[PDB]
Design a protein around this ligand. Structure first.
Ligand SMILES: [Ca+2]
Length: 97
């Protein structure tokens, strides 16, 4: 038996650096993020999705995506999501302390 020194390429992780959606809008992290390796194959299923994006409250939520190749190469990237309101709801100073 034995092994040959083949140049393994580190997995190509594809993640959008920034996203913008509305309150009540749909957001699927596993649809917009992919990961492909040449030697091991499709690593999209291996993607670790950290963080949480809410679509009921307006604000910025950052998601983390980390994927590892079986050959030992690991890569990670983040996505900055910004949710905004679909109507005019003004703020009269939240007096709730
Ligand atoms: Ca590889």
């Amino acid at each position: 038996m034995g092994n040959g020194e083949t140049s393994d390429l580190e997995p190509k992780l594809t993640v959008p650096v920034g996203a913008t959606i509305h309150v009540g809008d749909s957001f699927v992290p596993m649809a917009e993020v992919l990961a492909i390796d040449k030697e091991d194959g499709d690593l999209t299923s291996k993607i670790k999705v950290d963080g949480e994006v809410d679509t009921t409250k307006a604000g910025t939520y950052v998601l983390t995506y980390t994927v590892t190749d079986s050959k030992g190469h690991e890569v990670t990237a983040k996505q900055t999501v910004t949710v905004k309101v679909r109507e005019e709801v003004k703020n009269d100073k939240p007096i709730l302390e």
